[PDB]
């Protein structure tokens, strides 16, 4: 399993310790307050009232927890994933990134707490 | 495994299939968006910024989800739990339900989709 | 989980730490060596070629693992148990016991080594 | 997870459809009768009073089953792995095989079943 932090303001993200490999279930939980500018916090599902202005995913609030795996797009991760397997093609380190607009996350704050861990299969 | 919704409105909460027993190792995730009553929703941590005027549980948010295990007091539920193990003596059905005031859920409006699951130990 | 060993000589069993309960899904595995009384050792799985004198277990070999879940009638075990659920009413402490004819443990030996532990549902 | 059997006259193996990766953590449970030559059958564990003439695993009993994750070498499986993680960093399928001598396996007979998963990690 891996446990870990993932900065606001971190435009690269969080690289994890999990390779997901095919076949894998995972689960995913995550927690805590973080901003993309504005005093207000919000949690791992972000600002449900904030425009799109160019997010790094447009499937996720801006201020949402979303993850890259190995080469993928970024994928909704929001409060966390429940016994989860990832489309087929899908492989490789697990990354935690925020959901900002690229070149606008030095304004952040906060961070989100993250467990992740592989399920039975 | 159980999954479900649990409604912001339901002061009696969530009955689930879920009996936790001792030694068990559970995992829960909740999404979604409620309201206790104003305008905003709120994730599963519930609104931050909300004094507490006598909740159902102490120790979350106004608007957080949260839990008895049979005839437990609340725990803190919020987005979920990662691989987690019950206080002692703590034994009996989940019951999932929104943290508000007793007596004041009748203009609360939303839910949470939660995913419960026993895991290996 | 439990881990530890079950002398063939036991005719009462071992007590493990495992309460099975309703719903529960288990594995074990078991290794080791034992006899019912000859110089030959058999593993888990008992003797195949030899006759039924009166075992508590009619549904396994002489010197095959059994166990009782709670008070329930034996119930193999051999090698292990994959992702198992019980029989319908059966619960409380797992107890090992090794398959020989009451009151003809005396001649006993050996041991097998056992893993308990519970698995996801 | 992967269930299905293993020849003991079959120098190749079973190749299963489950691929072991690093972190891995994996169940194994193995059960059945099989024979190197003798009139004699032994379980998963084989023979303990059997000479090595050159086994394909030095590290396991003739008769016991034995497997390769990828092009490694020889693993002793026995009656099975309880909560297993792989000792060297070796990545591929798994396949099962009977630990006989090379070019003796014509006098083998029986097999073994053999259950498969991959455990929370
Ligand atoms: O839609 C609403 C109001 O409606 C509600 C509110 C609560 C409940 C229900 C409805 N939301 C707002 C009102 C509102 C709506 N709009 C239009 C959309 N907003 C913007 O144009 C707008 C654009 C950018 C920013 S902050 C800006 O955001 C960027 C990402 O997009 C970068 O991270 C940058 O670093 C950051 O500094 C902030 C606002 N402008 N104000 C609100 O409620 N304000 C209070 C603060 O939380
Ligand atoms: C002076 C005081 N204030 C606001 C202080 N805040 C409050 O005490 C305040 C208290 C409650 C509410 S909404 C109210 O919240 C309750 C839970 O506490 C109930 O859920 C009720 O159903 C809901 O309608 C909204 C605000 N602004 N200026
Ligand atoms: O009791 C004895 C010894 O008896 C003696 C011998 C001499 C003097 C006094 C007593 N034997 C014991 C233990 C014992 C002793 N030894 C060493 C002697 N045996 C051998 O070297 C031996 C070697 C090979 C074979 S079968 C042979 O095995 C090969 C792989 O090794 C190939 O698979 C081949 O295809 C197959 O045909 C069978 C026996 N191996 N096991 C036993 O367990 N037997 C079965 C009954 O319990
Ligand atoms: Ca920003
Ligand atoms: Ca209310
Ligand atoms: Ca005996
Ligand atoms: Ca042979």
């Given at each position: 399993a891996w446990k870990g932090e993932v900065l606001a303001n971190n435009e690269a993200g969080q690289v994890?310790?999990?390779?997901?490999?095919?076949g894998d279930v995972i689960t995913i939980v995550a927690a805590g307050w973080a901003s993309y500018?504005?005093?207000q916090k919000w949690g791992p599902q972000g600002d449900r009232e904030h425009p799109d202005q160019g997010l790094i995913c447009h499937d996720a609030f801006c201020g949402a927890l979303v993850m890259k795996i190995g080469n993928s797009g970024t994928i909704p991760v929001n409060t966390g994933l429940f016994?989860?397997?990832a489309p087929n093609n899908?492989?490789?380190?697990?990354?935690?990134?925020?959901n900002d607009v690229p070149g606008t996350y030095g304004n952040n704050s906060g961070s989100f707490?993250?467990?992740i861990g592989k399920d039975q299969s």
């Amino acid at each position: 399993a891996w446990k870990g932090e993932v900065l606001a303001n971190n435009e690269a993200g969080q690289v994890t310790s999990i390779i997901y490999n095919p076949g894998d279930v995972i689960t995913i939980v995550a927690a805590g307050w973080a901003s993309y500018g504005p005093t207000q916090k919000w949690g791992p599902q972000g600002d449900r009232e904030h425009p799109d202005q160019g997010l790094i995913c447009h499937d996720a609030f801006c201020g949402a927890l979303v993850m890259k795996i190995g080469n993928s797009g970024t994928i909704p991760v929001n409060t966390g994933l429940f016994r989860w397997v990832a489309p087929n093609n899908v492989q490789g380190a697990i990354t935690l990134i925020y959901n900002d607009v690229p070149g606008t996350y030095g304004n952040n704050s906060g961070s989100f707490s993250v467990n992740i861990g592989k399920d039975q299969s």
